[PDB]
Design a protein around this ligand. Structure first.
Ligand SMILES: O=c1ccn([C@@H]2O[C@H](COP(=O)(O)O)[C@@H](O)[C@H]2O)c(=O)[nH]1
Ligand SMILES: O=c1ccn([C@@H]2O[C@H](COP(=O)(O)O)[C@@H](O)[C@H]2O)c(=O)[nH]1
Ligand SMILES: [Ca+2]
Ligand SMILES: [Ca+2]
Ligand SMILES: [Zn+2]
Ligand SMILES: [Zn+2]
Ligand SMILES: [Zn+2]
Ligand SMILES: [Zn+2]
Lengths: 524, 524
């Protein structure tokens, strides 16, 4: 039997530096985790020990920290090249800076193949990008070869900025003929590496005949066999075994997100490329693993430009940006309006003739707004100022919520009003009126929402059975601040852009801001 | 006696081409008026006939048509040089593109002196601009000399974009010592040429000892002695005689605006430089005066770049821009919101710690919105599209209105609601609620306005005795659509930027627009 060790990362999301346990900024270095310097140490150790190793990334290195803001993917090519990745699949966030922001910095500078079998280009773009990503690559591993076939979420146009000259095909439709072709070329060991989420990964394992292993991402899925090593709660065993339509057992793996874990799967293959066994577990990259000194020194050199950028003017405000708790936990506050307006702007994506934009609505818990910004520094706003407002290292995500669920969220917003608690909601594209003389659970007396399926945006009453797209913090999508109804009833969730970055981009675009309090939230 | 002919223009406001009688686009060429080619013909005729002639401009050549949008003052230097102007005073609109947009295109390219005695610079700007405008110039005229002393509205910081490195001093305070100095240098014939408005021109004539003549502007004042030749109604005789504190009669002149008239004043002086007599009248530049063929051919060559610019993309919309009458004469319409938001953005000026901005409020009659803009041309918006929405050649002006006057305007807005009449108001920085079941004059049931003297903009009830700054079309400042209360009760009026240009700049800055209908106007 021929044994392969697959090492894999996914959804690293710009966590170049080691992090806290929750993947936010490292404070107590002695307890920090992840980062590329520590990953280097562990990969190097494994490569000393195991003869046949592939290091794979299932996408979404782009977007998540000031590294991406400043270096725009150059840091991804540089540090993935230093780690000697063998292959990477395109994730949705690889399109955040458009096709141009993918071709240049990443496709042209990577020393490993970048893969996606279900993305096609037309017009002059097709000639410009031809060969810079591939449907698959056949890699030599010891005296054998292994085919790696990529895929990317069909939903990328709604979750990033790929433009109108790329088409994202159904994954299984695109993958099958490529896997069929590799069989005709005497490639009998095939890994599907891609970025569509755990549910689609299981469908690929089931339906794409000849796939031996699926290495996925996008959904930040943590899988584990045994007692888990940290705070993440497993969604299933590692690997997750799918029974394929051809009767084979097909392992499916993912490794959470944020570079906290290194996925590690050992596969035994017979002479015909059938999987005989698979076993492993992600490895928690905790402080017991030293940061590689050479990688750490290069990280510290690259950090200088981040420190310099952090104090640069992004734009100006001519108004006080009231992020005080005394405002934002009690009533509409202009910082809340700014952040929600930035959230909606960030989610302007290419539209049908069927909608002006696919999403129009935003909620933001006031407890998530952690500082005001004074306008009397010549109006200057810096990244450092925004990091004081939004210090948690979160994202502004896209969810689908029934109106009934959103009504329950607005009732929860004021269930115990008057205590300065964090659940009070700031809004965009929503007008709410409360009557606090009513019983908890029955205080929302008006709730109107901005249309999407309309050529002129206007407000309509919220409908209980209609499903609305809403931009909101990951903290709330995960049921933080008591919003259990959001976690338990949402129909879709996709992780979005870094919270600070969303607001910084909006302020940079606007140049001079003057958000008002305007009656999005009223009391009767 | 030594006789001087003073020819003068003011507030030409980018009317390079001949115009309709109302100074808008020329349609019936046989009845058109003004323009620089016709002015050239008349000035040339007068210079053949009169030995001692000065051609003066009292400011505000900048701003008013697509000429200024495209050529940014190069057209002003070019065509004023072709007409051989002798001197120009700085107007407020000469600062519309900042100091940089005055130095380059106009101060560096004019072949005549540009004057203002009451503008001072500090810091590096003082060295950069030194000598490029002057407090005064002494000009040879035949065998004599005439001093010309300039001035500019002290209010320019509220009416343009001069920046924070220029100080506009009180006109009379600045002028007196310069006029005193010219007396010490044996200059006994002195013209004050400047841009502060007819009321300040009369105060200068009264109070600045040694001024022989005041040639003014800014207020678009039409003066005439006799039966007037066109639609403009005189504010007084031409010249308007002021009795000075020293006991002299001091003529004050102005010549309307828009290049429709050439001011013409004949002055007789004694040997000591005292005015013995003054007489004249503006000359209506009607179609009986031929356009100079050479100037007209140069105008037609410069027009090519305007035609090319007119069809260029300024920005995009992802929403239908509903400028229909069926919307904008009946209810809040998103085109109205866009235009009012552009109006407020245009009027962001440097602020005290006393206000976030000096003005926060906008009204716009729905009858002034003449087309929608379809978003299905790949979202493109062009100047030509905006000219269909705003076809009248107006400006968006700054007025001061008591709350009582603004309440009466909102009652007038709906006095005969339901007939598709033009007076229905679109708004910005104002939230109004009507009850149309009430009697005409008593239909406004709520009227809230955005604060200015506040660090966080928020809405307060309108106060009847408080004076509010409001941006609105010149058509409404002049009492159009039955808004007689605005004309008759306003406390201040200053002419603003060209209507199309205001919206074009805003769309260019925003890049992608998506204005909503959001409850600025409601019905109960
Ligand atoms: O990741 C986080 C953690 C807390 N929070 C907010 O912080 C609040 C706690 O703030 P406080 O203890 O300082 O009152 C909590 O109620 C939330 O609203 C977030 O928004 N995101
Ligand atoms: O300079 C002008 C002339 C008319 N108008 C508007 O045009 C309206 C007349 O339009 P109508 O005749 O097409 O109904 C008038 O009631 C005003 O609202 C302006 O706004 N500006
Ligand atoms: Ca196989
Ligand atoms: Ca004199
Ligand atoms: Zn991701
Ligand atoms: Zn993803
Ligand atoms: Zn003017
Ligand atoms: Zn003026």
């Amino acid at each position: 039997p021929w044994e392969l060790t697959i090492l894999h990362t996914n959804d690293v999301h710009s966590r170049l530096e080691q992090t806290s346990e929750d993947s936010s900024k490292c404070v107590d270095a002695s307890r920090c985790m992840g980062g590329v310097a520590r990953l280097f140490t562990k990969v190097q150790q494994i490569r000393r020990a195991e003869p046949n190793v592939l290091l794979l990334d299932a996408g979404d290195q782009y977007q998540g920290t000031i590294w991406f803001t400043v270096y725009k993917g150059a840091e991804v090519a540089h540090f993935m090249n230093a780690l000697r990745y063998d292959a990477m699949a395109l994730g949705n966030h690889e399109f955040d800076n458009g096709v141009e922001g993918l071709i240049e910095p990443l496709l042209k500078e990577a020393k490993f193949p970048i893969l996606s079998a279900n993305i096609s280009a037309s017009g002059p773009l097709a000639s410009q990008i031809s060969g810079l990503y591939l449907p698959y690559k056949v890699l030599p591993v010891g005296d054998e070869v292994v085919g790696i076939v990529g895929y990317t979420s069909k939903e990328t146009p709604f979750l990033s900025n790929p433009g109108t000259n790329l088409v994202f095909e159904d994954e299984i439709t695109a993958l099958q003929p490529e896997v069929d072709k590799l069989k005709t070329l005497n490639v009998n060991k095939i890994i599907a590496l891609g970025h569509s989420g755990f549910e689609m990964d299981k469908l690929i394992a089931q339906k794409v005949r000849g796939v031996d292993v699926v290495v996925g991402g996008h959904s930040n899925t943590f899988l584990y066999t045994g007692n888990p090593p940290s705070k993440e709660v497993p969604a299933g065993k590692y690997p997750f075994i799918v029974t394929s339509d051809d009767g084979r057992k097909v392992p499916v793996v993912q490794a959470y997100a944020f570079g906290k874990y290194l996925g590690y799967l050992k596969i035994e293959f017979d002479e015909r490329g059938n999987v005989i066994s698979s076993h492993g577990n992600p490895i928690l990259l905790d402080s017991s693993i030293p940061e590689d000194p050479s990688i750490k020194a290069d990280i510290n050199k690259w950090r200088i430009k981040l420190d310099d950028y952090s104090t640069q003017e992004l734009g100006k405000t001519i108004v006080y940006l009231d992020g005080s708790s005394q405002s934002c936990r009690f009533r509409e506050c202009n910082m809340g309006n700014l952040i929600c307006d930035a959230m909606i702007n960030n989610n302007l994506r290419h539209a049908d003739e069927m909608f002006w934009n696919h999403v129009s609505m935003c909620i933001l818990n006031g407890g998530g707004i952690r500082s005001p910004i004074d306008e009397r520094n010549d109006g200057t706003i810096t990244w450092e100022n925004l990091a004081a407002v939004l210090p948690f290292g979160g994202t502004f995500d896209l969810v689908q919520l029934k109106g009934s669920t959103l009504k329950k969220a607005f009732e929860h917003s004021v269930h115990r009003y008057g205590q300065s608690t964090g659940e009070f909601l700031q809004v965009g594209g929503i007008h709410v009126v409360y009557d606090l003389s009513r019983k908890p659970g029955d205080r929302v007396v008006k709730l109107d929402v901005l249309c999407t399926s309309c050529r002129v945006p206007s407000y309509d009453p919220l409908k209980m059975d209609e499903v609305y797209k809403v931009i909101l913090p990951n903290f709330l999508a995960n049921g933080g601040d008591g919003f259990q109804m959001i976690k338990d009833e949402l129909l879709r969730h996709d992780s979005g852009d870094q919270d600070i970055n969303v607001v910084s981009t909006y302020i940079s675009k606007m140049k001079v801001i003057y958000p008002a309090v305007e009656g999005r939230i009223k009391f009767s």
